[PDB]
Design an enzyme around this catalytic site. Structure first.
Site, mmCIF file in Angstrom:
data_model
loop_
_atom_site.group_PDB
_atom_site.id
_atom_site.type_symbol
_atom_site.label_atom_id
_atom_site.label_comp_id
_atom_site.label_asym_id
_atom_site.label_seq_id
_atom_site.Cartn_x
_atom_site.Cartn_y
_atom_site.Cartn_z
ATOM 1 N N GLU A 35 40.678 52.440 -22.193
ATOM 2 C CA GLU A 35 40.902 52.285 -22.903
ATOM 3 C C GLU A 35 41.916 50.186 -21.737
ATOM 4 O O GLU A 35 41.488 49.480 -22.246
ATOM 5 C CB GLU A 35 42.577 51.933 -23.184
ATOM 6 N N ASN A 46 41.595 40.746 -31.174
ATOM 7 C CA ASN A 46 41.132 41.069 -32.421
ATOM 8 C C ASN A 46 41.513 40.434 -33.641
ATOM 9 O O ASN A 46 41.147 39.541 -33.852
ATOM 10 C CB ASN A 46 41.956 42.832 -32.661
ATOM 11 N N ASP A 48 40.967 40.397 -36.177
ATOM 12 C CA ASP A 48 42.321 40.216 -37.717
ATOM 13 C C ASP A 48 43.240 39.223 -37.196
ATOM 14 O O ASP A 48 44.204 39.805 -37.934
ATOM 15 C CB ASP A 48 42.125 41.590 -38.589
ATOM 16 N N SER A 50 45.662 41.121 -35.113
ATOM 17 C CA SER A 50 46.334 41.883 -33.816
ATOM 18 C C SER A 50 45.810 41.873 -32.799
ATOM 19 O O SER A 50 44.685 41.517 -31.972
ATOM 20 C CB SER A 50 46.101 43.157 -34.386
ATOM 21 N N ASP A 52 45.927 44.431 -28.564
ATOM 22 C CA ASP A 52 46.231 45.984 -28.253
ATOM 23 C C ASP A 52 47.095 45.434 -26.936
ATOM 24 O O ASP A 52 46.675 44.820 -26.448
ATOM 25 C CB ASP A 52 45.304 46.514 -28.186
ATOM 26 N N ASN A 59 47.830 48.873 -31.203
ATOM 27 C CA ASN A 59 47.686 48.028 -32.028
ATOM 28 C C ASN A 59 48.642 47.255 -32.895
ATOM 29 O O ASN A 59 49.785 47.809 -33.421
ATOM 30 C CB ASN A 59 46.905 48.499 -32.984
#
Length: 129
Positions: A35, A46, A48, A50, A52, A59
């Site tokens: 990760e 991301n 969209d 967002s 992380d 997120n």
């Protein structure tokens, strides 16, 4: 900071993640490796809107609030900046809430892709825990 493998295994253990919801310590160490590569400051944008955040790439659309994500739900009720700390406490507390959400560790794509199935215990061998 960048945690060393065993150093992280010991911190996550101290924070009650070994077997939490049925997932042995190695699962968590394995998720951290793929990760964020054990970096508490990793972030990733991301499509969209967002981002992380942190060692566990939590997120901003559902879990923490970063004030710039459209549709933000803030379910761990925490500012996303609290997740980039050298203290994994806030990331661990929020992960405990994500995993309880009826899907488990499938929330983490790197985990289902690279850890689910394999010998996750390899991630903890050689460490004093």
């Amino acid at each position: 900071k960048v945690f060393g493998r065993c150093e992280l295994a010991a911190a996550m253990k101290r924070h009650g993640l070994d077997n939490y919801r049925g997932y042995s310590l190695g699962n968590w160490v394995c998720a951290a490796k793929f990760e964020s590569n054990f970096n508490t400051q990793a972030t990733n944008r991301n499509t969209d809107g967002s981002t992380d955040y942190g060692i566990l790439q939590i997120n901003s659309r559902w879990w923490c609030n970063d004030g710039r994500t459209p549709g933000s739900r803030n379910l761990c009720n925490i500012p996303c900046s609290a997740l980039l700390s050298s203290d994994i406490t806030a990331s661990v507390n929020c992960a405990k809430k994500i995993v309880s959400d009826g899907n488990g560790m499938n929330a983490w794509v790197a985990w289902r892709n690279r850890c689910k199935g394999t010998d996750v215990q390899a991630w903890i061998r050689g460490c004093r825990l």
